[PDB]
Write a protein that binds this ligand. Structure first.
Ligand SMILES: Nc1nc2[nH]c(CCNc3ccc(C(=O)N[C@@H](CCC(=O)O)C(=O)O)cc3)cc2c(=O)[nH]1
Length: 207
């Protein structure tokens, strides 16, 4: 891994290389200029128990729209961003050779994500391992474990870090500091992650 900019990780769905995709679905739209995902990938992002991972958001009763939308953006960011290089690593599992680890999510993105989920419900604090997939999609391990979302994710930083086994590492930096990744941004104002990736690829450069 010598070049960490304008590159796609090697997971279950990514393309080999970044590239224009003017047909991306609704929330994935800000990556139409340069994406790692396909029209279909972005399309399944937005759906319940998707073709992507058969993942069930409504494992603890219906998940509130205001919350689910954040998960859809995350999915977009993970499946579409070309600027995640500096945090790519190898792990070698049955469904992805590579993945991202300790992405410095902008303080607010995390807080807002945390905030919008207050009303929703979950049963696990780790959404990568532990689900009963018998049914065809992930169901609750201990069916009676269903608690308020903030019960398993007490603070924002807990949510963003632990829910995806440390794919994020919530930065102290705020949106626009040039030092953290935004999973929400206005494409009309340009892709702010492009400068963030470039910065961090230099701070860890050489050996
Ligand atoms: N930011 C960010 N978002 C992300 N979204 C996703 C999507 C990832 N969803 C899935 C989570 C769990 C499963 C699953 O079958 N688990 C098994 C064990 C999984 C395994 O080790 O083989 C279990 O329950 O025991 C499938 C998809 C990743 C991911 C990520 O890495 N980062």
């Amino acid at each position: 891994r010598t070049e960490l900019l304008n590159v796609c990780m090697n997971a279950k769905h990514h393309k080999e290389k970044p590239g224009p995709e003017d047909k991306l679905h609704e929330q994935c739209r800000p990556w139409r200029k340069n994406a790692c995902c396909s029209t279909n990938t972005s399309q399944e992002a937005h759906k319940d128990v998707s073709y992507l991972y058969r993942f069930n958001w409504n494992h603890c009763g219906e998940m509130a729209p205001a919350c689910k939308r954040h998960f859809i953006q995350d999915t977009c960011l993970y499946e579409c961003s070309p600027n995640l290089g500096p945090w790519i690593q190898q792990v070698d599992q049955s469904w992805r050779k590579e993945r991202v680890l300790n992405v410095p999510l902008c303080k607010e993105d995390c807080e807002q994500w945390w905030e919008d989920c207050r009303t929703s419900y979950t049963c696990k604090s780790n959404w990568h391992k532990g689900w009963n997939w018998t049914s065809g999609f992930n169901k609750c391990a201990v069916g009676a474990a269903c608690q308020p979302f903030h019960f398993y994710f007490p603070t924002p930083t807990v949510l963003c870090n632990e829910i995806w086994t440390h794919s994020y590492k919530v930065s102290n930096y705020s949106r626009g500091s040039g030092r953290c990744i935004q999973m929400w941004f206005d494409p009309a104002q340009g892709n702010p992650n492009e400068e963030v990736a470039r910065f961090y690829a230099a701070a860890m450069s050489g050996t």
